[PDB]
From Swiss-Prot:
This is FACT complex subunit SSRP1. The HMG box DNA-binding domain mediates DNA-binding. It has both affinity and specificity for DNA damaged globally with cisplatin. The modification N-acetylalanine is found at residue 3. Component of the FACT complex, a general chromatin factor that acts to reorganize nucleosomes. The FACT complex is involved in multiple processes that require DNA as a template such as mRNA elongation, DNA replication and DNA repair. During transcription elongation the FACT complex acts as a histone chaperone that both destabilizes and restores nucleosomal structure. The gene is SSRP1. Autoantibodies against SSRP1 are present in sera from patients with systemic lupus erythematosus, but not other rheumatic diseases. It is found in: Nucleus; Nucleus, Nucleolus; Chromosome. Belongs to the SSRP1 family. Phosphorylated by CK2 following UV but not gamma irradiation. Phosphorylation inhibits its DNA-binding activity. Interacts with MYOG (via C-terminal region). Component of the FACT complex, a stable heterodimer of SSRP1 and SUPT16H. Also a component of a CK2-SPT16-SSRP1 complex which forms following UV irradiation, composed of SSRP1, SUPT16H, CSNK2A1, CSNK2A2 and CSNK2B. Binds to histone H3-H4 tetramers, but not to intact nucleosomes. Identified in a centromere complex containing histones H2A, H2B and H4, and at least CENPA, CENPB, CENPC, CENPT, CENPN, HJURP, SUPT16H, SSRP1 and RSF1. Interacts with isoform gamma of TP63. Interacts with FYTTD1/UIF. Interacts with SRF. Interacts with NEK9. There is a cross-link at residue 91 (Glycyl lysine isopeptide (Lys-Gly) (interchain with G-Cter in SUMO2)). It comes from Homo sapiens (Human). Signal peptide: none annotated.
């Protein structure tokens, strides 16, 4: 079932063991994460993405993304059941296929 946006208000950015809680939002154009505590926003354009990985992490499952400029983004705390919709979104809108690891 196709969706143009996906929202996750209960996930974290993982940075060196730190779990930064925030809001993740996927649109056709890309990805925005906003750190709840610090308010720090990170934008990722669909075009920038070269790699998407889905794997078990410390809490549930997580995405690990790579962009053309070498930046790494890790968003953790997904229930495993989210794979289908995430995989679907990436393949449909981002023209990239999540690697299951």
């Amino acid at each position: 079932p196709m969706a143009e946006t996906l929202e996750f208000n209960d996930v974290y950015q993982e940075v060196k063991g730190s779990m930064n809680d925030g809001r993740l939002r996927l649109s056709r154009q890309g990805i925005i994460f906003k750190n709840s505590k610090t308010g720090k926003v990170d934008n990722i354009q669909a075009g920038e993405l070269t790699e998407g990985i889905w794997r078990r992490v410390a809490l549930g499952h997580g995405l690990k993304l790579l962009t053309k400029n070498g930046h790494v983004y890790k968003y953790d705390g997904f229930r495993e059941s989210e794979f289908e919709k995430l995989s679907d979104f990436f393949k449909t809108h981002y023209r990239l296929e999540l690697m299951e690891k």
